[PDB]
Every structure is written in C-alpha cells, then in structure tokens.
C-alpha cells in the first residue's frame, strides 16, 4: 500500500461583528424552598439546590474550525 | 506500506469585534430555604446548596481552531 | 513500513477586539438558609453551601489553537 496524502487548505473563517453588548442573564428567580421529613436513603444522594451551573458565554467572535485527518489499518 | 503525509494550511480564523460590553449575569435570586427532619442516609451524600459553579466567560475574541492528525496500525 | 510525515501550517488565529468591559457577575443572592434536625449519615458527606466555585473569565483575546499529532502501532 502506497499513500500520498497532501491536503491543502486556504480555508478562512471570520466575523466582523460591529458592536456586541447589553446582554443580561438572570437565573436568580424567587424562593426555592425544600422541606423534607422521615425520608430514608439506602444508597448515594447527589442533591443540587438553588441556582447552580448557569453560564453566560459571550465571545466577541466565536469561530471554531474543528479539523481532523485520520488514517487507520 | 509507504505513507507521504504532507498536509498544508494557510488556514485563517479571525474576529474584528468592534466593542464588547454591558454584560450582566445574576444567579443571585431570592431565598433558598432548606429544612430537613428525621432524614436518614446509609451511603454517601454530595449536597450542593445556593449559587454555585456559575460562569461568565467573555473572551474579546474566542476563536478555537482544533486540529487532529492521527495514524494507527 | 515507511512514513514521511511533513505537515505545514502558515495557520493564523486572531482577534481585533476594539474595546472590552462593563462586565458584571453577581451570584450573591438573598438568604440561603439550611435548618436540620435528627439527621443521620452512615457514610461520607460532602456538603457545599453558599456561593462557591463561581467564575468570571474575561481575556482581552482568548483564542485557543489546540493541535494534536499522533502516530501509533
């Protein structure tokens, strides 16, 4: 088996976002309330309560060229 | 086997973001009240309460070229 | 097995973010309250309470070329 493997990219990925802003994200709602009585757990518990893990993500340009060359035998 | 693996890129990933700002992220809500009585656990507990793990990510440009070349036998 | 492995990049990853700022992140809500009575644990507990692990991340440019080359037999 002979392989010549000679890809070429002039590949161009761009943004000209003129202005970006006035972005508001507010997961802070009203009362969370949890009340619990006489409840039994025989195995593991992973309780998450409140306003967890929320994201704001504002890349001024967010271009993402993913690229993969793979050979296998 | 013979391989001549010779890829080329002139590959260009860019952002001309003119002005980025006025971004607000507020997971700070109202109360988070937890009350608990006579409550039994036989195995591991991983309680998380409140306003945890939240993110604000604002890269002035966030361009992310990812490029994998892989050969395997 | 013969391999010639000679990739080329003139590859360019850029930002011209003109201005960046006025970013606010506020996980500090109202009262978290936890009250507990007659509560029993036979194995490990990993309680987290309040406003932990929060992130603000504002790189003036945050471009991230990742690039992997791998050969294996």
């Amino acid at each position: 088996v002979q392989i010549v493997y000679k890809p070429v990219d002039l590949s161009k990925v761009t943004s000209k976002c003129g202005s970006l802003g006035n972005i508001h994200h507010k997961p802070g709602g009203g009362q969370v309330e949890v009340k619990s009585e006489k409840l039994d757990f025989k195995d593991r518990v992973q309780s998450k309560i409140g306003s967890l893990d929320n994201i704001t993500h504002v890349p001024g340009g967010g271009n993402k060229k993913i690229e993969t060359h793979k050979l296998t035998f």
Side-chain angles (χ1 to χ4, degrees), chain A residues 39-68:
Chain A
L39 189 79
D40 297 8
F41 305 86
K42 300 190 185 187
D43 212 315
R44 298 189 176 168
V45 180
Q46 304 186 10
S47 180
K48 274 184 173 185
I49 306 173
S51 50
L52 321 186
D53 295 302
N54 314 90
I55 299 174
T56 284
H57 179 194
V58 190
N63 308 280
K64 184 177 301 188
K65 191 186 193 209
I66 311 297
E67 187 182 337
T68 296

PDB file of all heavy atoms in Angstrom, chain A residues 39-68:
ATOM      1  N   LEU A  39     -37.638  10.655  55.509  1.00  0.00           N
ATOM      2  CA  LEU A  39     -37.333  10.062  54.213  1.00  0.00           C
ATOM      3  C   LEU A  39     -35.943   9.417  54.221  1.00  0.00           C
ATOM      4  O   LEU A  39     -34.964  10.023  54.648  1.00  0.00           O
ATOM      5  CB  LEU A  39     -37.619  11.088  53.107  1.00  0.00           C
ATOM      6  CG  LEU A  39     -37.532  10.503  51.688  1.00  0.00           C
ATOM      7  CD1 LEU A  39     -38.798   9.717  51.313  1.00  0.00           C
ATOM      8  CD2 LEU A  39     -37.412  11.655  50.689  1.00  0.00           C
ATOM      9  N   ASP A  40     -35.875   8.156  53.797  1.00  0.00           N
ATOM     10  CA  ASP A  40     -34.737   7.271  54.041  1.00  0.00           C
ATOM     11  C   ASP A  40     -34.054   6.878  52.731  1.00  0.00           C
ATOM     12  O   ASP A  40     -34.705   6.411  51.797  1.00  0.00           O
ATOM     13  CB  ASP A  40     -35.188   5.976  54.736  1.00  0.00           C
ATOM     14  CG  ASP A  40     -35.798   6.109  56.136  1.00  0.00           C
ATOM     15  OD1 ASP A  40     -36.050   7.230  56.621  1.00  0.00           O
ATOM     16  OD2 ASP A  40     -36.045   5.050  56.754  1.00  0.00           O
ATOM     17  N   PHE A  41     -32.735   7.023  52.678  1.00  0.00           N
ATOM     18  CA  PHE A  41     -31.914   6.751  51.506  1.00  0.00           C
ATOM     19  C   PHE A  41     -30.894   5.657  51.822  1.00  0.00           C
ATOM     20  O   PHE A  41     -29.969   5.853  52.606  1.00  0.00           O
ATOM     21  CB  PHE A  41     -31.213   8.046  51.081  1.00  0.00           C
ATOM     22  CG  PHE A  41     -32.140   9.220  50.823  1.00  0.00           C
ATOM     23  CD1 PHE A  41     -32.536  10.051  51.883  1.00  0.00           C
ATOM     24  CD2 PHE A  41     -32.586   9.501  49.523  1.00  0.00           C
ATOM     25  CE1 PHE A  41     -33.348  11.166  51.640  1.00  0.00           C
ATOM     26  CE2 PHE A  41     -33.397  10.617  49.281  1.00  0.00           C
ATOM     27  CZ  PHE A  41     -33.769  11.457  50.337  1.00  0.00           C
ATOM     28  N   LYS A  42     -31.034   4.498  51.179  1.00  0.00           N
ATOM     29  CA  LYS A  42     -30.155   3.337  51.389  1.00  0.00           C
ATOM     30  C   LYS A  42     -28.873   3.385  50.560  1.00  0.00           C
ATOM     31  O   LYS A  42     -27.977   2.575  50.766  1.00  0.00           O
ATOM     32  CB  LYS A  42     -30.920   2.041  51.103  1.00  0.00           C
ATOM     33  CG  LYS A  42     -32.145   1.860  52.006  1.00  0.00           C
ATOM     34  CD  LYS A  42     -32.705   0.446  51.830  1.00  0.00           C
ATOM     35  CE  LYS A  42     -33.994   0.267  52.632  1.00  0.00           C
ATOM     36  NZ  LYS A  42     -34.450  -1.139  52.602  1.00  0.00           N
ATOM     37  N   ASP A  43     -28.792   4.307  49.612  1.00  0.00           N
ATOM     38  CA  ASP A  43     -27.737   4.425  48.608  1.00  0.00           C
ATOM     39  C   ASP A  43     -27.452   5.913  48.330  1.00  0.00           C
ATOM     40  O   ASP A  43     -28.101   6.792  48.899  1.00  0.00           O
ATOM     41  CB  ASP A  43     -28.165   3.642  47.353  1.00  0.00           C
ATOM     42  CG  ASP A  43     -26.990   3.013  46.595  1.00  0.00           C
ATOM     43  OD1 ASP A  43     -25.967   3.698  46.387  1.00  0.00           O
ATOM     44  OD2 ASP A  43     -27.095   1.828  46.207  1.00  0.00           O
ATOM     45  N   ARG A  44     -26.450   6.213  47.509  1.00  0.00           N
ATOM     46  CA  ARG A  44     -25.873   7.550  47.364  1.00  0.00           C
ATOM     47  C   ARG A  44     -26.849   8.621  46.888  1.00  0.00           C
ATOM     48  O   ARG A  44     -27.746   8.350  46.099  1.00  0.00           O
ATOM     49  CB  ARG A  44     -24.612   7.483  46.498  1.00  0.00           C
ATOM     50  CG  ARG A  44     -23.592   6.599  47.216  1.00  0.00           C
ATOM     51  CD  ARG A  44     -22.207   6.593  46.595  1.00  0.00           C
ATOM     52  NE  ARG A  44     -21.313   5.793  47.444  1.00  0.00           N
ATOM     53  CZ  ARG A  44     -20.109   5.369  47.126  1.00  0.00           C
ATOM     54  NH1 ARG A  44     -19.537   5.704  46.009  1.00  0.00           N
ATOM     55  NH2 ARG A  44     -19.457   4.605  47.942  1.00  0.00           N
ATOM     56  N   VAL A  45     -26.649   9.849  47.356  1.00  0.00           N
ATOM     57  CA  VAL A  45     -27.503  11.015  47.089  1.00  0.00           C
ATOM     58  C   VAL A  45     -26.653  12.180  46.609  1.00  0.00           C
ATOM     59  O   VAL A  45     -25.609  12.459  47.190  1.00  0.00           O
ATOM     60  CB  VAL A  45     -28.296  11.401  48.345  1.00  0.00           C
ATOM     61  CG1 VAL A  45     -29.201  12.606  48.111  1.00  0.00           C
ATOM     62  CG2 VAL A  45     -29.159  10.238  48.809  1.00  0.00           C
ATOM     63  N   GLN A  46     -27.090  12.890  45.575  1.00  0.00           N
ATOM     64  CA  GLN A  46     -26.321  13.953  44.927  1.00  0.00           C
ATOM     65  C   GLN A  46     -27.150  15.225  44.746  1.00  0.00           C
ATOM     66  O   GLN A  46     -27.210  15.801  43.666  1.00  0.00           O
ATOM     67  CB  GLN A  46     -25.703  13.421  43.632  1.00  0.00           C
ATOM     68  CG  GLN A  46     -24.842  12.171  43.865  1.00  0.00           C
ATOM     69  CD  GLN A  46     -24.102  11.717  42.619  1.00  0.00           C
ATOM     70  OE1 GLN A  46     -24.052  12.387  41.597  1.00  0.00           O
ATOM     71  NE2 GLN A  46     -23.489  10.558  42.653  1.00  0.00           N
ATOM     72  N   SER A  47     -27.840  15.638  45.802  1.00  0.00           N
ATOM     73  CA  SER A  47     -28.752  16.782  45.808  1.00  0.00           C
ATOM     74  C   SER A  47     -28.083  18.089  45.391  1.00  0.00           C
ATOM     75  O   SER A  47     -27.079  18.490  45.967  1.00  0.00           O
ATOM     76  CB  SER A  47     -29.354  16.942  47.200  1.00  0.00           C
ATOM     77  OG  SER A  47     -30.239  18.034  47.217  1.00  0.00           O
ATOM     78  N   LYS A  48     -28.646  18.768  44.397  1.00  0.00           N
ATOM     79  CA  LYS A  48     -28.280  20.116  43.964  1.00  0.00           C
ATOM     80  C   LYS A  48     -29.478  21.045  44.109  1.00  0.00           C
ATOM     81  O   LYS A  48     -30.509  20.778  43.503  1.00  0.00           O
ATOM     82  CB  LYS A  48     -27.838  20.038  42.503  1.00  0.00           C
ATOM     83  CG  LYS A  48     -26.355  19.695  42.334  1.00  0.00           C
ATOM     84  CD  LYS A  48     -25.994  19.745  40.846  1.00  0.00           C
ATOM     85  CE  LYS A  48     -24.494  19.587  40.615  1.00  0.00           C
ATOM     86  NZ  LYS A  48     -24.152  19.762  39.181  1.00  0.00           N
ATOM     87  N   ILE A  49     -29.357  22.135  44.857  1.00  0.00           N
ATOM     88  CA  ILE A  49     -30.456  23.061  45.154  1.00  0.00           C
ATOM     89  C   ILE A  49     -30.012  24.498  44.928  1.00  0.00           C
ATOM     90  O   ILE A  49     -28.963  24.903  45.409  1.00  0.00           O
ATOM     91  CB  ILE A  49     -30.971  22.860  46.596  1.00  0.00           C
ATOM     92  CG1 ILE A  49     -31.368  21.400  46.884  1.00  0.00           C
ATOM     93  CG2 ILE A  49     -32.157  23.787  46.882  1.00  0.00           C
ATOM     94  CD1 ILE A  49     -31.715  21.107  48.343  1.00  0.00           C
ATOM     95  N   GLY A  50     -30.825  25.303  44.262  1.00  0.00           N
ATOM     96  CA  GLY A  50     -30.630  26.744  44.152  1.00  0.00           C
ATOM     97  C   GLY A  50     -30.469  27.184  42.707  1.00  0.00           C
ATOM     98  O   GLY A  50     -31.304  26.853  41.874  1.00  0.00           O
ATOM     99  N   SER A  51     -29.402  27.901  42.384  1.00  0.00           N
ATOM    100  CA  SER A  51     -29.152  28.464  41.053  1.00  0.00           C
ATOM    101  C   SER A  51     -27.726  28.150  40.643  1.00  0.00           C
ATOM    102  O   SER A  51     -26.830  28.984  40.655  1.00  0.00           O
ATOM    103  CB  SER A  51     -29.468  29.961  41.036  1.00  0.00           C
ATOM    104  OG  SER A  51     -28.842  30.634  42.107  1.00  0.00           O
ATOM    105  N   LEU A  52     -27.504  26.877  40.336  1.00  0.00           N
ATOM    106  CA  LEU A  52     -26.181  26.311  40.094  1.00  0.00           C
ATOM    107  C   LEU A  52     -25.851  26.205  38.610  1.00  0.00           C
ATOM    108  O   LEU A  52     -26.741  26.124  37.773  1.00  0.00           O
ATOM    109  CB  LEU A  52     -26.077  24.913  40.714  1.00  0.00           C
ATOM    110  CG  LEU A  52     -26.754  24.715  42.072  1.00  0.00           C
ATOM    111  CD1 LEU A  52     -26.419  23.323  42.568  1.00  0.00           C
ATOM    112  CD2 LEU A  52     -26.256  25.699  43.111  1.00  0.00           C
ATOM    113  N   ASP A  53     -24.569  26.078  38.280  1.00  0.00           N
ATOM    114  CA  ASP A  53     -24.058  25.731  36.949  1.00  0.00           C
ATOM    115  C   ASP A  53     -24.443  26.672  35.791  1.00  0.00           C
ATOM    116  O   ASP A  53     -24.076  26.393  34.654  1.00  0.00           O
ATOM    117  CB  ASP A  53     -24.383  24.263  36.605  1.00  0.00           C
ATOM    118  CG  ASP A  53     -23.680  23.234  37.492  1.00  0.00           C
ATOM    119  OD1 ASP A  53     -22.431  23.248  37.530  1.00  0.00           O
ATOM    120  OD2 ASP A  53     -24.355  22.340  38.053  1.00  0.00           O
ATOM    121  N   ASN A  54     -25.159  27.776  36.010  1.00  0.00           N
ATOM    122  CA  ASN A  54     -25.560  28.656  34.913  1.00  0.00           C
ATOM    123  C   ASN A  54     -24.361  29.333  34.247  1.00  0.00           C
ATOM    124  O   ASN A  54     -23.395  29.682  34.911  1.00  0.00           O
ATOM    125  CB  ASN A  54     -26.565  29.711  35.379  1.00  0.00           C
ATOM    126  CG  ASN A  54     -27.672  29.152  36.233  1.00  0.00           C
ATOM    127  OD1 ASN A  54     -27.554  29.101  37.441  1.00  0.00           O
ATOM    128  ND2 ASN A  54     -28.760  28.723  35.646  1.00  0.00           N
ATOM    129  N   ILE A  55     -24.445  29.591  32.947  1.00  0.00           N
ATOM    130  CA  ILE A  55     -23.357  30.121  32.134  1.00  0.00           C
ATOM    131  C   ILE A  55     -23.850  31.327  31.353  1.00  0.00           C
ATOM    132  O   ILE A  55     -24.916  31.290  30.755  1.00  0.00           O
ATOM    133  CB  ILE A  55     -22.829  29.047  31.162  1.00  0.00           C
ATOM    134  CG1 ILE A  55     -22.266  27.830  31.909  1.00  0.00           C
ATOM    135  CG2 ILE A  55     -21.760  29.639  30.235  1.00  0.00           C
ATOM    136  CD1 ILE A  55     -21.860  26.663  31.017  1.00  0.00           C
ATOM    137  N   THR A  56     -23.014  32.345  31.257  1.00  0.00           N
ATOM    138  CA  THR A  56     -23.051  33.341  30.190  1.00  0.00           C
ATOM    139  C   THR A  56     -21.741  33.248  29.465  1.00  0.00           C
ATOM    140  O   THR A  56     -20.691  33.171  30.090  1.00  0.00           O
ATOM    141  CB  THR A  56     -23.256  34.748  30.733  1.00  0.00           C
ATOM    142  OG1 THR A  56     -24.593  34.891  31.085  1.00  0.00           O
ATOM    143  CG2 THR A  56     -22.969  35.886  29.774  1.00  0.00           C
ATOM    144  N   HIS A  57     -21.780  33.244  28.150  1.00  0.00           N
ATOM    145  CA  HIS A  57     -20.627  32.981  27.320  1.00  0.00           C
ATOM    146  C   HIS A  57     -20.714  33.853  26.095  1.00  0.00           C
ATOM    147  O   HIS A  57     -21.566  33.630  25.250  1.00  0.00           O
ATOM    148  CB  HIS A  57     -20.616  31.497  26.988  1.00  0.00           C
ATOM    149  CG  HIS A  57     -19.490  31.059  26.106  1.00  0.00           C
ATOM    150  ND1 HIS A  57     -19.446  29.834  25.455  1.00  0.00           N
ATOM    151  CD2 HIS A  57     -18.324  31.716  25.886  1.00  0.00           C
ATOM    152  CE1 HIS A  57     -18.260  29.788  24.840  1.00  0.00           C
ATOM    153  NE2 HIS A  57     -17.574  30.910  25.075  1.00  0.00           N
ATOM    154  N   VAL A  58     -19.897  34.892  26.024  1.00  0.00           N
ATOM    155  CA  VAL A  58     -20.023  35.937  25.013  1.00  0.00           C
ATOM    156  C   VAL A  58     -18.680  36.176  24.342  1.00  0.00           C
ATOM    157  O   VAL A  58     -18.015  37.157  24.636  1.00  0.00           O
ATOM    158  CB  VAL A  58     -20.627  37.218  25.601  1.00  0.00           C
ATOM    159  CG1 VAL A  58     -20.976  38.213  24.502  1.00  0.00           C
ATOM    160  CG2 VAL A  58     -21.911  36.943  26.369  1.00  0.00           C
ATOM    161  N   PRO A  59     -18.212  35.276  23.473  1.00  0.00           N
ATOM    162  CA  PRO A  59     -17.005  35.521  22.719  1.00  0.00           C
ATOM    163  C   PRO A  59     -17.250  36.601  21.663  1.00  0.00           C
ATOM    164  O   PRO A  59     -18.188  36.497  20.883  1.00  0.00           O
ATOM    165  CB  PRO A  59     -16.661  34.162  22.129  1.00  0.00           C
ATOM    166  CG  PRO A  59     -18.010  33.492  21.927  1.00  0.00           C
ATOM    167  CD  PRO A  59     -18.827  34.024  23.089  1.00  0.00           C
ATOM    168  N   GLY A  60     -16.414  37.633  21.615  1.00  0.00           N
ATOM    169  CA  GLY A  60     -16.566  38.743  20.664  1.00  0.00           C
ATOM    170  C   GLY A  60     -16.548  38.334  19.194  1.00  0.00           C
ATOM    171  O   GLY A  60     -17.169  38.970  18.354  1.00  0.00           O
ATOM    172  N   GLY A  61     -15.893  37.223  18.893  1.00  0.00           N
ATOM    173  CA  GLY A  61     -16.200  36.351  17.767  1.00  0.00           C
ATOM    174  C   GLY A  61     -15.828  34.946  18.194  1.00  0.00           C
ATOM    175  O   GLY A  61     -14.854  34.781  18.915  1.00  0.00           O
ATOM    176  N   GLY A  62     -16.617  33.941  17.857  1.00  0.00           N
ATOM    177  CA  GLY A  62     -16.534  32.624  18.492  1.00  0.00           C
ATOM    178  C   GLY A  62     -16.295  31.503  17.511  1.00  0.00           C
ATOM    179  O   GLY A  62     -16.797  30.403  17.697  1.00  0.00           O
ATOM    180  N   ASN A  63     -15.601  31.788  16.419  1.00  0.00           N
ATOM    181  CA  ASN A  63     -15.436  30.857  15.317  1.00  0.00           C
ATOM    182  C   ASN A  63     -14.608  29.659  15.715  1.00  0.00           C
ATOM    183  O   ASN A  63     -13.597  29.784  16.395  1.00  0.00           O
ATOM    184  CB  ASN A  63     -14.805  31.562  14.134  1.00  0.00           C
ATOM    185  CG  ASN A  63     -15.560  32.808  13.792  1.00  0.00           C
ATOM    186  OD1 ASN A  63     -16.585  32.763  13.140  1.00  0.00           O
ATOM    187  ND2 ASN A  63     -15.102  33.942  14.235  1.00  0.00           N
ATOM    188  N   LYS A  64     -14.987  28.480  15.262  1.00  0.00           N
ATOM    189  CA  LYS A  64     -14.450  27.252  15.812  1.00  0.00           C
ATOM    190  C   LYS A  64     -14.199  26.302  14.670  1.00  0.00           C
ATOM    191  O   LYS A  64     -14.991  25.399  14.429  1.00  0.00           O
ATOM    192  CB  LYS A  64     -15.467  26.761  16.849  1.00  0.00           C
ATOM    193  CG  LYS A  64     -15.020  25.514  17.620  1.00  0.00           C
ATOM    194  CD  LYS A  64     -16.035  25.104  18.692  1.00  0.00           C
ATOM    195  CE  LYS A  64     -16.277  26.216  19.720  1.00  0.00           C
ATOM    196  NZ  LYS A  64     -17.114  25.736  20.848  1.00  0.00           N
ATOM    197  N   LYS A  65     -13.100  26.490  13.937  1.00  0.00           N
ATOM    198  CA  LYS A  65     -12.706  25.465  12.976  1.00  0.00           C
ATOM    199  C   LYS A  65     -12.175  24.252  13.727  1.00  0.00           C
ATOM    200  O   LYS A  65     -11.023  24.205  14.121  1.00  0.00           O
ATOM    201  CB  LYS A  65     -11.656  26.039  12.020  1.00  0.00           C
ATOM    202  CG  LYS A  65     -11.459  25.062  10.864  1.00  0.00           C
ATOM    203  CD  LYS A  65     -10.324  25.485   9.936  1.00  0.00           C
ATOM    204  CE  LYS A  65     -10.395  24.659   8.651  1.00  0.00           C
ATOM    205  NZ  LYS A  65      -9.052  24.490   8.063  1.00  0.00           N
ATOM    206  N   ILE A  66     -12.953  23.200  13.765  1.00  0.00           N
ATOM    207  CA  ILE A  66     -12.526  21.855  14.136  1.00  0.00           C
ATOM    208  C   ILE A  66     -12.071  21.175  12.854  1.00  0.00           C
ATOM    209  O   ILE A  66     -12.707  21.321  11.817  1.00  0.00           O
ATOM    210  CB  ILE A  66     -13.669  21.032  14.760  1.00  0.00           C
ATOM    211  CG1 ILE A  66     -14.458  21.738  15.877  1.00  0.00           C
ATOM    212  CG2 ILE A  66     -13.145  19.675  15.246  1.00  0.00           C
ATOM    213  CD1 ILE A  66     -13.662  22.092  17.124  1.00  0.00           C
ATOM    214  N   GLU A  67     -11.004  20.385  12.887  1.00  0.00           N
ATOM    215  CA  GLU A  67     -10.356  19.779  11.716  1.00  0.00           C
ATOM    216  C   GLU A  67      -9.665  18.441  12.030  1.00  0.00           C
ATOM    217  O   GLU A  67      -9.019  18.323  13.062  1.00  0.00           O
ATOM    218  CB  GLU A  67      -9.430  20.796  11.072  1.00  0.00           C
ATOM    219  CG  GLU A  67      -8.862  20.258   9.765  1.00  0.00           C
ATOM    220  CD  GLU A  67      -7.880  21.236   9.119  1.00  0.00           C
ATOM    221  OE1 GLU A  67      -7.948  22.450   9.415  1.00  0.00           O
ATOM    222  OE2 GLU A  67      -7.082  20.768   8.281  1.00  0.00           O
ATOM    223  N   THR A  68      -9.906  17.354  11.303  1.00  0.00           N
ATOM    224  CA  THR A  68      -9.415  16.028  11.677  1.00  0.00           C
ATOM    225  C   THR A  68      -9.005  15.224  10.466  1.00  0.00           C
ATOM    226  O   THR A  68      -9.809  14.974   9.576  1.00  0.00           O
ATOM    227  CB  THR A  68     -10.461  15.252  12.470  1.00  0.00           C
ATOM    228  OG1 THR A  68     -10.710  15.912  13.682  1.00  0.00           O
ATOM    229  CG2 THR A  68      -9.999  13.850  12.840  1.00  0.00           C
TER     230      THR A  68
END
